[PDB]
Write an enzyme that holds these catalytic residues in place. Structure first.
Site, PDB file in Angstrom:
ATOM      1  N   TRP A 183      -9.062   6.822  -0.751  1.00 43.27           N
ATOM      2  CA  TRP A 183      -9.268   7.638  -1.934  1.00 43.27           C
ATOM      3  C   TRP A 183      -8.270   7.181  -2.989  1.00 43.27           C
ATOM      4  O   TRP A 183      -7.270   6.546  -2.674  1.00 43.27           O
ATOM      5  CB  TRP A 183      -9.105   9.139  -1.651  1.00 43.27           C
ATOM      6  CG  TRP A 183      -7.832   9.522  -0.965  1.00 43.27           C
ATOM      7  CD1 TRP A 183      -6.583   9.686  -1.548  1.00 43.27           C
ATOM      8  CD2 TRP A 183      -7.664   9.813   0.423  1.00 43.27           C
ATOM      9  NE1 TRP A 183      -5.667  10.048  -0.585  1.00 43.27           N
ATOM     10  CE2 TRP A 183      -6.310  10.143   0.628  1.00 43.27           C
ATOM     11  CE3 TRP A 183      -8.542   9.842   1.519  1.00 43.27           C
ATOM     12  CZ2 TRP A 183      -5.804  10.475   1.884  1.00 43.27           C
ATOM     13  CZ3 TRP A 183      -8.040  10.177   2.767  1.00 43.27           C
ATOM     14  CH2 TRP A 183      -6.683  10.495   2.938  1.00 43.27           C
ATOM     15  N   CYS A 236       0.836  -1.199   0.000  1.00 46.74           N
ATOM     16  CA  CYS A 236       0.000   0.000   0.000  1.00 46.74           C
ATOM     17  C   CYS A 236       0.870   1.247   0.000  1.00 46.74           C
ATOM     18  O   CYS A 236       1.619   1.489   0.954  1.00 46.74           O
ATOM     19  CB  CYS A 236      -0.953   0.044   1.207  1.00 46.74           C
ATOM     20  SG  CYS A 236      -1.913   1.571   1.208  1.00 46.74           S
ATOM     21  N   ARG A 286       0.071   4.559   2.936  1.00 48.28           N
ATOM     22  CA  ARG A 286       0.149   4.345   4.381  1.00 48.28           C
ATOM     23  C   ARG A 286       0.615   5.550   5.197  1.00 48.28           C
ATOM     24  O   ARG A 286       0.598   5.452   6.430  1.00 48.28           O
ATOM     25  CB  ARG A 286       1.061   3.153   4.659  1.00 48.28           C
ATOM     26  CG  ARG A 286       0.380   1.825   4.381  1.00 48.28           C
ATOM     27  CD  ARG A 286       1.361   0.670   4.594  1.00 48.28           C
ATOM     28  NE  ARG A 286       2.428   0.653   3.587  1.00 48.28           N
ATOM     29  CZ  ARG A 286       3.546  -0.049   3.714  1.00 48.28           C
ATOM     30  NH1 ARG A 286       3.828  -0.687   4.839  1.00 48.28           N
ATOM     31  NH2 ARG A 286       4.406  -0.109   2.686  1.00 48.28           N
ATOM     32  N   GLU A 322      -4.781   4.232 -10.706  1.00 47.20           N
ATOM     33  CA  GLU A 322      -5.620   3.053 -10.489  1.00 47.20           C
ATOM     34  C   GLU A 322      -6.804   3.032 -11.451  1.00 47.20           C
ATOM     35  O   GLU A 322      -7.207   1.963 -11.930  1.00 47.20           O
ATOM     36  CB  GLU A 322      -6.123   3.013  -9.049  1.00 47.20           C
ATOM     37  CG  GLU A 322      -5.029   2.998  -8.004  1.00 47.20           C
ATOM     38  CD  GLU A 322      -5.609   2.999  -6.587  1.00 47.20           C
ATOM     39  OE1 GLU A 322      -6.028   1.917  -6.117  1.00 47.20           O
ATOM     40  OE2 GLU A 322      -5.636   4.082  -5.967  1.00 47.20           O
TER      41      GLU A 322
HETATM   42  C1  HEM Z   1      -6.034   6.720   1.846  1.00 46.66           C
HETATM   43  C2  HEM Z   1      -5.642   6.590   0.569  1.00 46.66           C
HETATM   44  C3  HEM Z   1      -5.099   5.265  -0.031  1.00 46.66           C
HETATM   45  C4  HEM Z   1      -4.424   5.197  -1.183  1.00 46.66           C
HETATM   46  C5  HEM Z   1      -4.053   6.401  -2.072  1.00 46.66           C
HETATM   47  C6  HEM Z   1      -4.084   3.816  -1.437  1.00 46.66           C
HETATM   48  C7  HEM Z   1      -3.394   3.334  -2.532  1.00 46.66           C
HETATM   49  C8  HEM Z   1      -3.179   2.005  -2.826  1.00 46.66           C
HETATM   50  C9  HEM Z   1      -2.772   1.451  -4.107  1.00 46.66           C
HETATM   51  C10 HEM Z   1      -2.524   2.280  -5.392  1.00 46.66           C
HETATM   52  C11 HEM Z   1      -2.650   0.123  -3.968  1.00 46.66           C
HETATM   53  C12 HEM Z   1      -2.247  -0.882  -5.072  1.00 46.66           C
HETATM   54  C13 HEM Z   1      -3.373  -1.886  -5.287  1.00 46.66           C
HETATM   55  C14 HEM Z   1      -3.763  -1.882  -6.736  1.00 46.66           C
HETATM   56  O1  HEM Z   1      -3.160  -1.079  -7.490  1.00 46.66           O
HETATM   57  O2  HEM Z   1      -4.662  -2.680  -7.116  1.00 46.66           O
HETATM   58  C15 HEM Z   1      -2.973  -0.216  -2.593  1.00 46.66           C
HETATM   59  C16 HEM Z   1      -2.966  -1.470  -2.016  1.00 46.66           C
HETATM   60  C17 HEM Z   1      -3.471  -1.784  -0.757  1.00 46.66           C
HETATM   61  N1  HEM Z   1      -4.000  -0.886   0.166  1.00 46.66           N
HETATM   62 FE1  HEM Z   1      -3.990   1.146   0.093  1.00 46.66          FE
HETATM   63  N2  HEM Z   1      -4.590   3.049  -0.399  1.00 46.66           N
HETATM   64  C18 HEM Z   1      -5.224   3.912   0.489  1.00 46.66           C
HETATM   65  C19 HEM Z   1      -5.904   3.540   1.642  1.00 46.66           C
HETATM   66  C20 HEM Z   1      -5.928   2.311   2.238  1.00 46.66           C
HETATM   67  C21 HEM Z   1      -6.624   1.930   3.463  1.00 46.66           C
HETATM   68  C22 HEM Z   1      -7.519   2.881   4.308  1.00 46.66           C
HETATM   69  C23 HEM Z   1      -6.364   0.623   3.679  1.00 46.66           C
HETATM   70  C24 HEM Z   1      -6.816  -0.297   4.841  1.00 46.66           C
HETATM   71  C25 HEM Z   1      -7.390   0.166   5.978  1.00 46.66           C
HETATM   72  C26 HEM Z   1      -5.488   0.160   2.607  1.00 46.66           C
HETATM   73  C27 HEM Z   1      -4.969  -1.106   2.443  1.00 46.66           C
HETATM   74  C28 HEM Z   1      -4.381  -1.611   1.296  1.00 46.66           C
HETATM   75  C29 HEM Z   1      -4.072  -3.003   1.050  1.00 46.66           C
HETATM   76  C30 HEM Z   1      -4.291  -4.188   2.013  1.00 46.66           C
HETATM   77  C31 HEM Z   1      -3.512  -3.103  -0.167  1.00 46.66           C
HETATM   78  C32 HEM Z   1      -3.039  -4.415  -0.818  1.00 46.66           C
HETATM   79  C33 HEM Z   1      -4.148  -4.925  -1.737  1.00 46.66           C
HETATM   80  C34 HEM Z   1      -3.801  -6.237  -2.403  1.00 46.66           C
HETATM   81  O3  HEM Z   1      -2.799  -6.906  -2.017  1.00 46.66           O
HETATM   82  O4  HEM Z   1      -4.546  -6.630  -3.337  1.00 46.66           O
HETATM   83  N3  HEM Z   1      -5.292   1.207   1.756  1.00 46.66           N
HETATM   84  N4  HEM Z   1      -3.274   0.959  -1.935  1.00 46.66           N
HETATM   85  C1  LIG Z   2      -8.675   1.431   0.339  1.00 49.39           C
HETATM   86  C2  LIG Z   2      -7.986   1.480  -1.012  1.00 49.39           C
HETATM   87  C3  LIG Z   2      -7.730   2.700  -1.624  1.00 49.39           C
HETATM   88  C4  LIG Z   2      -7.089   2.721  -2.868  1.00 49.39           C
HETATM   89  N1  LIG Z   2      -6.832   3.900  -3.489  1.00 49.39           N
HETATM   90  N2  LIG Z   2      -6.743   1.565  -3.465  1.00 49.39           N
HETATM   91  C5  LIG Z   2      -6.972   0.363  -2.886  1.00 49.39           C
HETATM   92  C6  LIG Z   2      -6.543  -0.913  -3.582  1.00 49.39           C
HETATM   93  C7  LIG Z   2      -7.599  -1.450  -4.541  1.00 49.39           C
HETATM   94  C8  LIG Z   2      -7.166  -2.799  -5.131  1.00 49.39           C
HETATM   95  C9  LIG Z   2      -7.033  -3.891  -4.064  1.00 49.39           C
HETATM   96  N3  LIG Z   2      -6.901  -5.262  -4.614  1.00 49.39           N
HETATM   97  C10 LIG Z   2      -7.693  -6.178  -3.767  1.00 49.39           C
HETATM   98  C11 LIG Z   2      -7.375  -5.349  -6.009  1.00 49.39           C
HETATM   99  C12 LIG Z   2      -7.602   0.301  -1.643  1.00 49.39           C
END
Ligand code: HEM
Ligand SMILES: Cc1cc(N)nc(CCCCN(C)C)c1
Ligand code: HEM
Ligand SMILES: C[C@H](O)[C@H](O)[C@H]1CNc2nc(N)[nH]c(=O)c2N1
Ligand SMILES: C[C@H](O)[C@H](O)[C@H]1CNc2nc(N)[nH]c(=O)c2N1
Ligand SMILES: Cc1cc(N)nc(CCCCN(C)C)c1
Ligand SMILES: [Zn+2]
Lengths: 418, 414
Positions: free
Chosen positions: A288, A116, A119, A293
């Site tokens: 957000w 992520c 974070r 994405e």
């Molecule tokens: C607040 C703004 C956030 C942004 C900009 C963001 C951005 C991203 C992006 C670009 C990815 C790559 C996944 C993909 O491209 O499909 C990701 C993965 C992930 N995010 Fe964040 N995220 C945010 C918030 C959060 C929150 C609030 C959580 C949990 C409470 C979280 C948990 C995760 C997890 C677990 C992954 C891994 C997903 C996977 O392995 O498929 N994210 N995030």
């Molecule tokens: C909370 C959140 C925000 C964001 N901007 N992006 C994500 C990941 C979406 C893809 C996750 N995988 C299971 C496919 C999650």
């Protein structure tokens, strides 16, 4: 200790946090599995209801960690809490988290999510405790309130809603949707696909469950909610809760006529939240978007909307050879338009330059105060323009800390219906 | 045991058994992945060299369908004799060729490996002086450049003995441009080469002090002090960079050289270490257009191009960097193609690598691949490698990093 170097700035960080990792990465000294989607099946407790000697050590480890975090290791409350968890496991084969432990666990699952890039915000997570929920109708109520809170008229706020933990694996709460808000995908008669091709199978399940599809390119899917192991039930999210952004381009007036839009709220709903041996199989969380994405993956993956075609056509590019880079050129324009549209409508969005910059700062903070930050380079580097973002040149160490978010099987592969 | 890799675009699933033949370490442990680390980490003894040599010879005779033959067993005994008597051994010409090609085939970071079996190998193990190295390197450059129709080649100088008599090309590539730090903190030329440029000037090179000065060769033979040589300019093919739509792009005065030729790596074959082994192919466009031109630490021309494009550079979310990056890479490819100098775009290159990878799984049981390096530095997810799971492991013969020689050489002049 292990060091990581940034090859742009020559900053070196020293990692000791990895000494607390519990789960295997999938790699060995002979093979690296860093580009594997699901490298490991190493779990902390067996495939269903653990015995006492399997669950209690995981509970004690987390309670120990939480009480250490608040400078109360060995305190009166800490020792009573252990006795309380012991009695709970003795009499129910599980235990119940306090509200404070639940909040701590959810925030640290996000903090430990090595894939992520977002974070830097990890301690600013609103946690909705839905562990009193008993039916799919109550799940819908909780999810509606979550969507309304998190959307906040475009000023998006990170949130997570936590439904009852797994007990014996036959009473699971599950959101069958992969995200709370997604567009349908329809298998066309000739062979093509209308809408979002990623969701064709889920779309057909919904139809197979009685959903009347409007058969458009941007049909918001119904919720398919499973409570206490029962058959899942369909619900329509009220459309005033679903904030959408029409996509326009600041230069190309013809871009509007493509009829594209996207939703504002990314809300993952098919992962599992693991805290101290407890498995929360329904824990939808939202934040957000990073613009790429939508504009790189949602619109331009070949097995998704695949609109590089049309945009390049309207741009009068030479699509005769790859070496004209018409795909790359149209890719940039689409991502410009996505950001321009969200910003114009005052819907929170971050560009990949800002996001990756934030993540480098987050990494530095985490090394300074925590002694490490687990990070998955393959996932952190944006899917376009990688090497002109600072994370490209940043060495990272990936390891697995608990509490954590985990993948879990799709419930239709495993649910036996009634 | 088997390992599966999946392509999430196509759903093709391939089965890796070749990883069971892997040797040294990845840097990863069971609890930490070091896949984004640049390099995770005197000479072999007799008892160390024996098993390494046997494994290579075994591999070679297996590849030619002669495993267990009289010739196989006699070669093993012959190699054992040499190690026993001389503490090293000498490769047969056929073994050197096989080894060099398989080091390329085994390079998990190289996207251009579909071409691995067409490598021209120049045996320079009879070389004794830096002048002889210069001659060998000139002939290599001329053969490989081929008037723009580039041909892959490697030249192999004598192997390490006691580590006190190493052959080394001190240049990181055979052809690179100088970089000069100015008193005001700016850079003229290529900032990546500032340090090596300093060393050349210290050794006596008279620098033209321009933006595209081809660096001289700094060549070390038999552990002696390295010596300077100017590559004949008629052997250095260059391409002026222009743009098919922006006529002003040519006014930037940019050019690049056509022949990419790595000269600072080590070739390990059967435990023998070839510390000087310059090899060359042809460019993928992003190597020049994305990294060489647009890395902040390199020529860093995004800003000037963005200015001439009238882009809004006040906010990152206008994506002016991304927009300029694409245009520069269009110019690079258009310029090389117009001058009929071999080049490959990253879409073509990654498509071919997927074909290569599949073929290697079918005929060899696997293909070690470093996703972090294989995926191009721009437009990653619109190329097919982005969606391709890959397994990384170290097979030998192999190309390896080695220390820079100015950090380990013990000088002897004055
Ligand atoms: C607040 C703004 C956030 C942004 C900009 C963001 C951005 C991203 C992006 C670009 C990815 C790559 C996944 C993909 O491209 O499909 C990701 C993965 C992930 N995010 Fe964040 N995220 C945010 C918030 C959060 C929150 C609030 C959580 C949990 C409470 C979280 C948990 C995760 C997890 C677990 C992954 C891994 C997903 C996977 O392995 O498929 N994210 N995030
Ligand atoms: C909370 C959140 C925000 C964001 N901007 N992006 C994500 C990941 C979406 C893809 C996750 N995988 C299971 C496919 C999650
Ligand atoms: C024929 C055309 C070739 C192309 C298009 C090509 C392409 C590439 C690219 C794009 C990289 C990534 C390196 C970077 O981005 O800096 C790479 C790495 C590499 N290539 Fe190839 N290559 C070619 C020929 C060869 C040959 C002939 C050899 C050896 C005989 C070779 C061996 C390697 C090695 C060892 C690396 C890893 C370098 C490192 O770790 O820094 N390549 N190649
Ligand atoms: C730290 C990081 O691994 C480093 O910047 C790598 C990333 N991937 C790369 N990929 C290629 N082809 N070339 C490179 O130099 C790098 N650099
Ligand atoms: C095979 C490869 O690991 C897979 O396509 C990964 C690569 N990196 C990614 N990075 C992000 N952010 N999201 C993804 O889905 C992927 N997919
Ligand atoms: C033979 C060859 C051809 C090509 N097109 N590219 C390369 C990689 C050079 C990069 C070396 N790295 C340390 C930076 C090699
Ligand atoms: Zn690894």
């Amino acid at each position: 200790f292990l060091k990581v170097k940034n090859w742009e700035t020559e900053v070196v960080l020293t990692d000791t946090l990895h000494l607390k990792s519990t789960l295997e990465t999938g790699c060995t000294e002979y093979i690296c599995m860093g580009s594997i989607m699901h490298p490991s099946q190493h779990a902390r407790r067996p495939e269903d209801v653990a015995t006492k000697d399997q669950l209690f050590p995981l509970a004690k480890e987390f309670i120990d960690q939480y009480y250490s975090s608040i400078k109360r290791f060995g305190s009166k409350a800490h020792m009573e809490r252990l006795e309380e968890v012991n009695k709970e496991i003795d009499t129910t084969s599980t235990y119940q988290l306090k509200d404070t432990e639940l909040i701590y666990g959810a925030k640290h699952a996000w903090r430990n999510a090595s894939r992520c890039v977002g974070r830097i915000q990890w301690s600013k997570l609103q946690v909705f405790d839905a562990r009193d929920c008993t039916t799919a109708h109550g799940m819908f109520n909780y999810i509606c309130n979550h969507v309304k809170y998190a959307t906040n008229k475009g000023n998006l706020r990170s949130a997570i809603t936590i439904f009852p933990q797994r007990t014996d694996g036959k009473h699971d709460f599950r959101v069958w949707n992969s995200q709370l808000i997604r567009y349908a995908g329809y298998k066309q008669p000739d062979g093509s696909t209308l809408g979002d091709p990623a969701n064709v199978q889920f779309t057909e399940i919904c139809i197979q469950q009685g959903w009347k599809p409007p058969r458009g390119r941007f049909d918001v899917l119904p919720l398919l909610l499973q409570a206490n192991g029962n058959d899942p039930e369909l619900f329509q999210i009220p459309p005033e809760l679903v904030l959408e952004v029409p996509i326009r381009h600041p230069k190309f007036e013809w871009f509007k006529d493509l009829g594209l839009k996207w939703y504002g709220l990314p809300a993952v709903s098919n992962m599992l939240l693991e805290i101290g041996g407890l498995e929360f199989s329904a824990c939808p969380f939202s934040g957000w978007y990073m613009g790429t994405e939508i504009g790189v993956r949602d619109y331009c993956d070949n097995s998704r909307y695949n609109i590089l075609e049309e945009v390049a056509k309207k741009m009068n590019l030479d699509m005769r050879k790859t070496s004209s880079l018409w795909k790359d050129q149209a890719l940039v324009e689409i991502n410009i338009a996505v950001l321009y549209s969200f910003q114009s409508d005052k819907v929170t969005i971050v560009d990949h330059h800002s996001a990756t910059e934030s993540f480098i700062k987050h990494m530095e903070n985490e090394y300074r105060c925590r002694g490490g930050c687990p990070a998955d380079w393959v996932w952190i580097v944006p899917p376009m323009s990688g090497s002109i973002t600072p994370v490209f040149h940043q060495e990272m160490l990936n390891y697995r800390l608990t509490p954590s978010f985990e993948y879990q099987p799709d419930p239709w592969n495993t649910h036996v219906w009634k």
